Enzyme design. Structure first.
Site, PDB file in Angstrom:
ATOM      1  N   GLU A  96     -60.697 -18.612  10.356  1.00  0.00           N
ATOM      2  CA  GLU A  96     -60.130 -19.813  10.955  1.00  0.00           C
ATOM      3  C   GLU A  96     -58.614 -19.706  11.075  1.00  0.00           C
ATOM      4  OE1 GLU A  96     -58.390 -22.475   9.275  1.00  0.00           O
ATOM      5  OE2 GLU A  96     -58.408 -23.731  11.070  1.00  0.00           O
ATOM      6  N   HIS A  97     -57.990 -18.922  10.196  1.00  0.00           N
ATOM      7  CA  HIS A  97     -56.568 -18.625  10.329  1.00  0.00           C
ATOM      8  C   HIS A  97     -56.309 -17.582  11.406  1.00  0.00           C
ATOM      9  CE1 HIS A  97     -55.980 -21.023   6.830  1.00  0.00           C
ATOM     10  NE2 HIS A  97     -54.679 -20.806   6.879  1.00  0.00           N
ATOM     11  N   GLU A 142     -50.512 -22.331   1.514  1.00  0.00           N
ATOM     12  CA  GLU A 142     -51.046 -23.674   1.707  1.00  0.00           C
ATOM     13  C   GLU A 142     -52.083 -24.082   0.671  1.00  0.00           C
ATOM     14  OE1 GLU A 142     -52.732 -24.157   5.455  1.00  0.00           O
ATOM     15  OE2 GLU A 142     -54.466 -22.890   5.068  1.00  0.00           O
TER      16      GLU A 142
END
Ligand SMILES: CCCCCCCCCCCCCCCCCC(=O)OC[C@H](COP(=O)([O-])OCC[N+](C)(C)C)OC(=O)CCCCCCCCCCCCCCCCC
Ligand SMILES: CCCCCCCCCCCCCCCCCC(=O)OC[C@H](COP(=O)([O-])OCC[N+](C)(C)C)OC(=O)CCCCCCCCCCCCCCCCC
Ligand SMILES: [Zn+2]
Lengths: 49, 95, 58, 446, 52, 57
Positions: free
Chosen positions: D60-61, D137
Site C-alpha cells: 500500500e506504500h 509513521e
C-alpha cells in the site's frame, strides 16, 4: 511500537472448549456460564439450608 | 481438557497417508471409487490406467445384468467387450 | 437448542429466575437431605435407637 | 410534495456486471461533473500469516512509487497533471485504492488504476526508504492514543487469531521484509475475482465497462498452486489488557463485546442502539439538555472528555461497544454509568427512545453518502461484504422494522451477562478489575 | 403530588416491569412458605408431604 | 485533503490535508523500538496458540 504488544499464550489455564482459535465462540459460552452459575446456585442452596 | 488427540493429517503414515493425500486432491490411484468417462465410441474409448501392460476389464455392458464380461486388456489398440461393443483402451502410466 | 444452553437461558440467565431456582432447590434439597441423613443415622445405629425398640413396649 | 420513501426510491440504482476474470465492475451515476473511481481488493491483515504481517501495508506504500510503464514520480506527475486526487487505505480485511477526478478524464484514470493493481515496480531503494517511512509513521501513530487502544482491543479480543495482528504489523517485520515476500503476497491476494472496480458520480456504466475490458482484462485469474486462501472464524476472548503510563494526562478505555458481522440483519438494530447512546466530546454545544442519558450525566458530573460508541464488522464477527477518554478520577464512575446504559437497553427501552435512535440512524445513513467518495466506498465495500449493493430504501425498510421489544431482545442477546473485552491506556488504576466490569454487565434486579 | 408519572412512557416502563416484579413476588412467597414451613401450601405439594 | 478512513465505524470520513494525505509525520528519523520483557518466560505465540498435547508422543 504499540503493535509489538502481543498477548501471550494462555492455553494452559484455558478452558477446554475455547482452546482452538479457529472455532468461533458464542457456541459454548452458555455452557461455561451455566457451569459456573450452577456452582454458585448449589452453594446458595446449601447455605440457605 | 487439552488438545492431545491428534488430527490424522499428521499421524497418517504409509498407504493411509498417500490415499488421504491423493483423495483430498480428488485423485484415486488405488481403486477406491468407480471410474468415470463412459464412452464406447471408436474414437473415444474407455480409458483405463495401469501399471503393467495387462489388466482385468469387466463389462457390465447393459444395465441390470447378471454376468460381467471379464477379459484381459493389453497395451496397444482398443478392442471391445466381445458381445456388446464398449471400447477399452489401456494406458500404463499410473504407478 | 442444546441442553446446557437452554438450562442457562431459562433458569440461570435472569436473576429472579435464578432466585426461584435456588428457593425450589432449597426446599427439595431439605426434604431429600433430611431423608438421606436420617436413613444413614438409623442404619449406623440399627436396633439401638428408641424407634427400633418402640414396638416391644407398645 | 415528496415524503421520505419517495425520495429514498428516487435515488439512482447501482449497476453491477461481471467480467470474464471475475472482476466485479459496479457504478452509479449522478449529475456531478466529477467522479470517484476505485479498486477494492479483498486483502488485509486477516490474510497475513504472522511472518508477512505488514505485507499489505508495505505494498500500500509502494503502490504509488512507480510501475513498469510509468517509472517513479512521472506516474505521480501524470495524476497531478490532471488535477486528480489519489488516496488509499488498508484495513484488516479490505484494501482500497481510490481516485477522485473529473468525469471528463474517465479513461486515463482507469488506465492508471490498472497498473497500480497489477504492474507495480518494487525497487530495492524504494523498499529501503519506504521501510524507514513506515517506521516513522508507526512512531507517529503511537501518539494517536485512540488508535493504540483500538489495536490493543483487537489484540486482546482476538488473541491467537489472524485478526489480532495490526495492519502495519510489528517493527521487526518492517525491518526484515524482503521483495520476494511482497511478491508472494501480491501473487496470492491480488487476483481478479476478489477485486471490485467501483465508480460513483457522473460516469457512464457502459463506458466504464469498456474501460475495464480494455485495461483490467486478465489481472491474475489463476491461483498458480490451486490454493484458495480461505477465511476461518476467529475465537472471541473475554479479556483485559492494561497498558499503564501515569505520565499521560488523559486515559482512553475501550470496552467491547461480540457483534455478529456484516451479513446478519440485527446489526441495523444494534446501530439503533448506538444511536441511542451516541457520541460526545467537550466541544459539543448542547449543555445539560442532550438527549443521550450518558451524555447528560457526564456533562452534569463533569466526568468525560469524550465518549463514542462503535459497531465494527468483519466476516461473521465483530466488536460492539464504547470508547472514552477522561481523566483518572472519573474513570470508574463512567464505567458504571456506561454499563447502566447498556442494561437499560437490555431491560427498559421505551418507544420514543427507539424512534429517536431510528431518526438518528436514518440521518446518519443518508448524510454519510454525500459526495462520490463515500458512495464509491459504500459500493466497493458492499460488493465485497454483502455480495451486493444494499439500496438505501432497503435500509429504510429494515430501520422501520425496529420497535422497542425486538431492540431490547437483541440488546439482551448481545450485551446482557456477556464477558467484555477491555483495553486501557493511561492513568488507569481507577479503572476496575475484570471482575467488577464483568459483574456490571448484568443487573441483580434484571 | 405523584402527578409526574402520568404518561405513556411510565406506563411502558410499568408493563416492562410487570413480569420481573411478579417473579420476584413469586420468589418471596415461595421463600416465605419454605422458611415458615406453612401448612396451607406445603400440604398441596407431592414430595414435601413426607413428614406429615 | 478530503477523505480519510477512520472514525471507528470503518468509514471514509472527512479529514484535514495534513493528516489525510500526509499520514507519516515530518519527524526525520525513527528513534527506537523498545523491547518487551516479561516476569516469567512466556510463550507468546501468535499462530495456533503454541502447542496442544498432554504427554510425550
Ligand atoms: C454464601 C454463598 C452465596 C453468596 C452470594 C451469591 O453468590 O449469590 C448468588 C448471586 C450472585 O452471585 P454471582 O456473582 O455468581 O452472580 C450470579 C449472576 N447471575 C445472576 C447472572 C446468574 O446473588 C443472587 O442471585 C442474589 C442473592 C439471592 C439468591 C437467591 C436466594 C433465594 C432464597 C431466598 C429465601
Ligand atoms: C419388560 C419391562 C421393562 C420396563 C419395566 C419398568 C418397571 C420395572 C420395575 C421398576 C422398579 C419398581 C420398584 C421401584 C420402587 C421401590 C420402592 C421401595 O421398595 O422403596 C423402599 C426402598 C427402601 O427405602 P430406604 O429408606 O432404604 O431408601 C433409602 C432412601 N434414601 C435414598 C432417601 C436414603 O427404597 C428403594 O428401593 C429406593 C430405590 C432407589 C433407586 C432407584 C433407581 C435409581 C436410578 C438407577 C439408574 C441410574 C441410571 C443413571
Ligand atoms: Zn460389454
Amino acid at each position: 511500537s504499540h503493535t509489538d504488544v502481543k498477548v501471550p499464550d494462555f492455553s494452559d489455564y484455558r478452558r477446554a472448549e475455547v482452546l482452538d482459535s479457529t472455532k468461533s465462540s458464542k457456541e459454548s459460552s452458555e455452557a461455561r456460564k451455566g457451569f459456573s452459575y450452577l456452582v454458585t446456585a448449589t452453594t446458595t442452596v446449601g447455605v440457605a439450608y | 481438557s487439552g488438545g492431545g488427540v491428534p488430527t490424522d493429517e499428521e499421524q497418517a503414515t504409509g498407504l493411509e497417508r498417500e490415499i488421504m493425500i491423493a483423495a483430498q486432491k480428488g485423485l484415486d490411484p488405488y481403486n477406491m471409487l468407480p471410474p468415470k468417462a463412459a464412452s464406447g465410441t471408436k474414437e473415444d474409448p474407455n480409458l483405463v490406467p495401469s501399471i503393467s501392460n495387462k489388466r482385468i476389464v469387466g463389462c457390465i455392458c447393459e444395465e441390470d445384468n447378471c454376468t460381467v464380461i471379464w477379459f484381459w486388456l493389453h497395451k496397444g489398440e482398443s478392442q471391445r467387450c466381445p458381445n456388446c461393443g464398449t471400447h477399452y483402451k489401456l494406458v500404463p502410466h499410473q504407478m | 437448542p442444546t441442553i446446557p444452553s437452554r438450562l442457562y437461558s431459562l433458569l440461570f440467565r435472569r436473576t429472579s429466575t435464578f432466585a426461584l431456582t435456588i428457593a425450589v432447590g432449597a426446599l427439595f434439597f431439605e426434604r431429600a437431605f433430611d431423608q438421606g441423613a436420617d436413613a444413614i443415622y438409623e442404619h449406623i445405629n440399627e436396633g439401638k435407637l428408641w424407634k427400633h425398640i418402640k414396638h416391644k413396649y407398645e | 410534495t415528496a415524503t421520505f420513501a419517495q425520495a429514498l426510491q428516487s435515488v439512482p440504482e447501482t449497476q453491477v456486471s461481471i467480467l470474464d476474470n471475475g472482476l466485479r465492475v459496479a457504478s452509479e451515476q449522478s449529475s456531478h461533473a466529477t467522479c470517484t473511481v476505485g479498486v477494492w481488493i479483498d486483502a488485509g491483515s486477516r490474510y497475513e500469516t504472522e511472518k508477512n504481517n505488514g505485507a499489505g501495508y508495505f505494498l500500500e506504500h509502494l503502490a504509488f512509487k512507480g510501475t513498469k510503464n510509468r517509472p517513479g514520480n512521472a506516474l505521480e506527475k501524470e495524476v497531478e497533471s490532471i488535477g486528480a486526487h489519489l488516496n488509499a487505505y488498508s484495513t484488516r480485511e479490505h484494501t482500497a485504492y481510490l481516485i477522485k477526478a473529473l468525469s471528463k478524464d474517465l479513461p486515463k484514470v482507469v488506465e492508471l488504476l490498472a497498473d497500480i493493481v497489477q504492474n507495480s515496480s518494487l525497487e530495492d531503494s524504494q523498499i529501503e526508504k519506504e521501510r524507514d517511512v513506515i517506521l516513522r509513521e508507526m512512531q507517529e501513530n503511537d501518539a494517536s492514543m485512540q488508535n493504540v487502544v483500538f489495536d490493543y482491543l483487537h489484540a486482546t479480543a482476538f488473541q491467537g487469531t489472524p485478526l489480532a495482528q495490526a495492519v502495519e504489523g510489528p517493527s521487526e517485520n518492517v525491518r526484515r521484509l524482503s521483495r520476494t515476500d511482497l511478491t508472494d503476497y501480491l501473487n496470492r491476494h491480488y487476483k481478479a475475482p476478489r477485486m471490485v472496480l467501483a465508480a460513483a458520480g457522473g460516469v457512464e456504466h457502459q463506458q466504464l465497462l469498456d474501460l475495464a475490458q480494455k485495461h483490467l482484462s486478465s489481472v491474475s485469474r489463476v491461483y498458480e498452486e490451486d490454493a484458495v486462501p480461505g477465511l476461518t472464524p476467529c475465537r472471541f476472548t473475554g479479556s483485559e489488557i492494561r497498558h499503564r503510563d501515569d505520565a499521560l494526562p488523559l486515559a482512553h478505555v475501550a470496552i467491547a463485546v461480540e457483534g455478529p458481522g456484516w451479513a446478519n440483519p440485527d446489526n441495523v438494530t444494534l446501530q439503533v442502539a448506538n444511536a441511542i447512546i451516541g457520541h460526545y466530546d467537550c466541544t459539543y454545544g448542547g449543555g445539560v439538555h442532550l438527549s443521550s442519558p450518558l451524555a447528560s450525566v457526564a456533562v452534569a458530573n463533569k466526568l468525560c472528555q469524550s465518549f463514542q460508541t462503535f459497531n465494527i464488522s468483519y466476516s461473521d464477527t465483530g466488536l460492539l461497544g464504547a470508547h472514552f477518554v477522561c481523566d483518572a478520577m472519573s474513570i470508574d464512575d463512567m464505567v458504571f454509568f456506561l454499563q447502566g446504559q447498556w442494561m437499560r437497553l437490555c431491560t427498559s427501552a421505551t418507544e420514543s427512545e427507539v424512534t429517536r435512535g431510528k431518526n438518528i440512524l436514518r440521518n446518519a445513513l443518508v448524510s454519510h453518502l454525500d459526495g462520490t467518495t463515500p458512495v464509491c466506498e459504500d459500493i466497493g465495500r458492499s460488493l465485497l461484504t454483502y455480495g451486493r449493493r444494499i439500496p438505501l430504501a432497503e435500509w429504510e425498510s429494515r430501520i422501520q422494522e425496529v420497535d422497542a421489544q425486538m431492540l431490547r431482545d437483541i440488546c439482551s442477546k448481545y450485551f446482557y451477562d456477556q464477558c467484555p473485552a477491555v483495553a486501557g491506556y493511561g492513568p488507569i488504576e481507577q479503572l476496575p478489575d475484570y471482575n467488577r466490569i464483568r459483574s456490571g454487565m448484568f443487573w441483580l434486579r434484571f | 403530588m405523584l402527578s409526574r408519572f402520568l404518561g405513556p412512557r411510565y406506563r411502558e416502563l410499568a408493563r416492562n416491569w410487570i413480569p420481573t416484579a411478579g417473579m420476584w413476588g413469586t420468589v418471596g412467597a415461595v421463600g416465605l412458605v419454605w422458611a415458615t414451613d406453612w401448612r396451607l401450601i406445603l400440604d398441596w405439594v407431592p414430595y414435601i408431604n413426607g413428614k406429615f | 485533503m478530503y477523505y480519510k478512513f477512520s472514525s471507528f465505524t470503518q468509514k471514509l470520513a472527512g479529514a484535514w490535508a495534513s493528516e489525510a494525505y500526509t499520514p507519516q509525520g515530518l519527524k526525520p528519523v525513527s528513534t527506537e523500538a523498545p523491547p518487551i520483557i516479561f516476569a516469567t518466560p512466556t510463550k507468546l505465540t501468535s499462530s495456533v496458540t503454541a502447542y496442544d498435547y498432554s504427554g510425550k508422543n
